[PDB]
Design a binder for this molecule. Sequence first.
Ligand code: C9E
Length: 156
Amino acid sequence: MGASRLYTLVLVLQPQRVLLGMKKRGFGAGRWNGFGGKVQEGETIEDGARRELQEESGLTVDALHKVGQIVFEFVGEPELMDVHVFCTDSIQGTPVESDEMRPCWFQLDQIPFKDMWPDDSYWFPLLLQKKKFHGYFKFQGQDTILDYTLREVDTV
Ligand SMILES: CCOC(=O)c1ccnc2[nH]ccc12
């Protein structure tokens, strides 16, 4: 309940590896993550996903697929974060470093969960298993999960 703000998150997932970026500034700096950000006025959610992927990594894609939705609450912040998660295996181009992100490929048994947001350990396996999901995570600061829910869905 309450006003929420729209965000995107894009995971480039190939058969034996996944592309992540080391966030170089701002919110989440110092952690590996997918590519994304705030959705702007005048663009769809999926347009916003492609825009952030191109700005942060130089990549474009043929198709994005909806895989999940995660709602974040941060203690003492008024806006909830409504994050729409997408995947793809159809990249056009070679990934390149930006002001915001330094991209690297990881093997699927070497995903660096110790240096990622702590909710990723819960929902990433569902992404890897190609299951669609709805998550909720309540955070105190950037390290501590106070409450969460997670379930599989038919419709994202
Ligand atoms: C795209 C904006 O997503 C983020 O703000 C965020 C916050 C907390 N855990 C997270 N895990 C992955 C992303 C993420």
